[PDB]
Amino acid sequence: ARFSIEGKSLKLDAITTEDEKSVFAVLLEDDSVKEIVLSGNTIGTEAARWLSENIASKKDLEIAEFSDIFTGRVKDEIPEALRLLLQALLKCPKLHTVRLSDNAFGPTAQEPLIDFLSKHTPLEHLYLHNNGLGPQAGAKIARALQELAVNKKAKNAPPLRSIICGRNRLENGSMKEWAKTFQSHRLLHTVKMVQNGIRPEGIEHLLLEGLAYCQELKVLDLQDNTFTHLGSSALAIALKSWPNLRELGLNDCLLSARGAAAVVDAFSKLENIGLQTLRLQYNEIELDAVRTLKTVIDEKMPDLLFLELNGNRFSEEDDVVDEIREVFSTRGRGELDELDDME
């Protein structure tokens, strides 16, 4: 059973009488509830206390979509409801996916968040995007998630599979911590830390000291973070570590021209590339690497389906473009994006 009040825009400081008889009747009557969507409403303290008691009873709850549930609330008054909700979830043994994005978590709201994240061993997919964390709080999430690995390990719990944490200003200052968090979770399948303001030295460290140890990695998205030649050379080295890589997201990462050359040259050296999606939008990439890429895709990437090169430093009119297009045509599979905004 799936319960949703999504986008109902409810200013719930508490749970009324008919609001309890006409809104959360299913959540208050059904026990086999497997999903709960509270996204798009404002949850006050009292309401949170109500839901908590009606959520801890759902022993088969697996998905908790609680993104966007505190808009309008005073940042430092959210901790009580958060704690009440997260502590109720720690009682749901089959809860594998938790989403808490689009929620402003100040340093205070971070305590119950940290305790929960460090204790919920059944967690497999976490979504924590756009919470205004920052470097300080970012390392706290990292650190807590490292405690999760230990608890999971002692309890034989399933491994963490997804980690979506972007648009949270993690930047360079919390990268030594995440590297450690990825060392703790080497069975990860999806990782997305887009738009965090991470810079060259943080990208390099994160890739080589962290992600590189994640061999089951299928999807990696480091969209909108500064790579430069440094970060790029660090990727060129990490690549060989992900034999199961399917999607590599690198849009707006300013890999640089030589950066991109180094990255393309790394791929050329990998055999059996099961890669399907390659995003290289706005990376200051120039013609020469695209020509090299052209060959690499044709000879070394038989499963490619999506290629993004818009915004780079070569023109759609260069002959390599029609060459690429022809690789797809002949194969009958794969597509290039529209190059309408080149440099």
Curated annotation (Swiss-Prot):
Q: Name one GO biological process term.
A: protein export from nucleus
Q: What are the site positions for Critical residue for GTP hydrolysis?
A: R73
**Matching InterPro entries, A to Z?**
LRR_dom_sf (IPR032675), RanGap (IPR027038)
Q: Which residues cross the membrane?
A: none
This entry's Gene Ontology molecular function terms read: GTPase activator activity; small GTPase binding
Segments annotated as LRR repeats: 22-47, 84-111, 112-140, 178-205, 206-234, 235-263, 264-292, 293-321
Q: Which UniProt keywords apply?
A: Cytoplasm, GTPase activation, Leucine-rich repeat, Repeat
Q: Which GO terms describe its cellular component?
A: cytoplasm; cytosol; nuclear periphery; nucleus; perinuclear region of cytoplasm
**Localisation per UniProt entry:** Cytoplasm; Cytoplasm, Perinuclear region
Function of the molecule: GTPase activator for the nuclear Ras-related regulatory protein spi1 (Ran), converting it to the putatively inactive GDP-bound state.
Q: Which family does the record assign?
A: Belongs to the RNA1 family.
- Stored PANTHER family: RAN GTPASE-ACTIVATING PROTEIN 1 (PTHR24113:SF12)
Question: What do we know about how this protein assembles, alone or with others?
Answer: Monomer.
Q: Report the protein name in the record.
A: Ran GTPase-activating protein 1
Record organism:
Schizosaccharomyces pombe (strain 972 / ATCC 24843) (Fission yeast)
In the UniProt record, the gene name given for this protein reads rna1
